[PDB]
Amino acid sequence: ENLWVTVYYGVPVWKDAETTLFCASDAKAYETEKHNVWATCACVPTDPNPQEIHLENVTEEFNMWKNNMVEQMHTDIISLWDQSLKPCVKLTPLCVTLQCTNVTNNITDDMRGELKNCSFNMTTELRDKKQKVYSLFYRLDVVQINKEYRLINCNTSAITQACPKVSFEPIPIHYCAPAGFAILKCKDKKFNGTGPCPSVSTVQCTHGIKPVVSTQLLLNGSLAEEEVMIRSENITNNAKNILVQFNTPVQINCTRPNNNTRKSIRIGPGQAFYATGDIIGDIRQAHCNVSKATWNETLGKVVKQLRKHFGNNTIIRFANSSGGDLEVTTHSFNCGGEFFYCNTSGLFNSTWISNNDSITLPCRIKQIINMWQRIGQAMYAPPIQGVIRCVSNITGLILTRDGGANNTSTETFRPGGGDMRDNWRSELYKYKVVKIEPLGVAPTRCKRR
């Protein structure tokens, strides 16, 4: 009748914790080679037949806003960027006076140049005679000084040129947990991403999450189930971003109608800088198309979900960003190696009450970037030959709401971003790390003599 303790080893007992996650990225991506593209070099090949065990009767609480995998992925991509830029050519003797001029074209005065034809000195292989060479830089890359210009990053940090061997192509990366840990996955169709989850399953490795670094518009993400999803840490708080996840992807087409030339000027001994030669064809600017019908149905489907939290009979008005840096006021992204910054004033210009072509957006291109608000490392994106064309999926947004309303029933939303951790929170909302404690004691009528 008197119970006795008994040690059980291998009990389903886990507790929320944080550990060191490793990578996984299939086996065909390693065949992409090209001198180690992005990260996949010594990454563990993904298990050909992954197992996902549905934990019956189990209801586990998730929290996408207090999840450590986001911080770990962020610091991992940062260290990746540094390790990818450590052995590349450093452009230290490139802050020389630039005697720039307009590009060869024919007016008007509203074209504001944009492209500058800079002539300057350069150090050759030998440490004696110099080199009077010319390049073609964007206005966002240069700045005049008292026509003589200079690189816009002279009195900020150093600069290193990205090696032409590596690529910035986001490839699926599976995050896995070591022995003794497990990753819980919420498999409900309406998980707005916080609190208890009815249908929880356990996995060793998450699905292929491509690290697409972008702002305002979430590109190449996971589609939502049924209705489009709206997630926020504090809806009544207008300072917290509102991550929107789409159900149907919005087809976007971005092009660079300036098929370019790569001049391989030689800053020897050894190093070599890739300048931009002459432009073959017409002087055109990069642009992005969004199908008008698709954007209408997507916006009309989102505003119907927005009315479920800010009152049924309210007016929802869309306005573009209020101001700041170029990385927040424009849709910043990477395509073909070039860094585009597109005008998103034609997408967020609407006013929805309670009840056939393409929208083109002017896209600028910058070569000298300082992403992740990093000071000390400026990367020069080498020019890319040929017309660059890319078709992507708009699968979500990062919105911000205007404050100090009080009066009025309308609410105004503007595109935001900045913090790149939000880009990872849109994919890690359905995963969390737990540690296994298999040692459990329990009483039963068992002993010895």
Partner: protein, 222 residues
Amino acid sequence: VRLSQSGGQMKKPGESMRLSCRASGYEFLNCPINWIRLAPGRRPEWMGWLKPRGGAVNYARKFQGRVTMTRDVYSDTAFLELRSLTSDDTAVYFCTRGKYCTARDYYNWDFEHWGRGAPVTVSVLTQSPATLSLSPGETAIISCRTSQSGSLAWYQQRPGQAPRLVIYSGSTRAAGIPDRFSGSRWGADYNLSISNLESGDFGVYYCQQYEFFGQGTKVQVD
């Protein structure tokens, strides 16, 4: 954490004004800076916030089209401009920073850090009572009725000084706040209780829910 503001100024109607606020002691990019105007005998008005990371901004409806907020990440200095000034704009303008501000996340609206303020002259939340005349030693009970709910804060403003965060989350004391200050809640009602009043405690107190503030309660010595 120190917010250093430029001095006040006298403008004429129709002109524009510009103010600066240099932050120090923390990573400027971690959390947004806010701009709030306080007019004598008027409900404090939150003008907008800026995230120094990328310079993201958010303006109050009343000011959209008139106000422009920027910043200089290198000098950690936040700038604001206000155009088409009218007599209604006379007020003391503050730059504020929330209490919780780490690398992981933040909470903007618990304004623990305030600039000295800039007096510029150009020429819901129901808080009660309006005034409170009490003797040293007594207990002051200030009330604030909400309609939305969410982390509520209490601030104290001493005559001629910048407001100081006193309580947040309705019941949690801030750094340096003694046990004499306590918060309570019942439904939509919020009560701030200050026991054993002393000279330093007298001033004006405000309840706050995100960007909305109360009408204020002046606690004076009698």
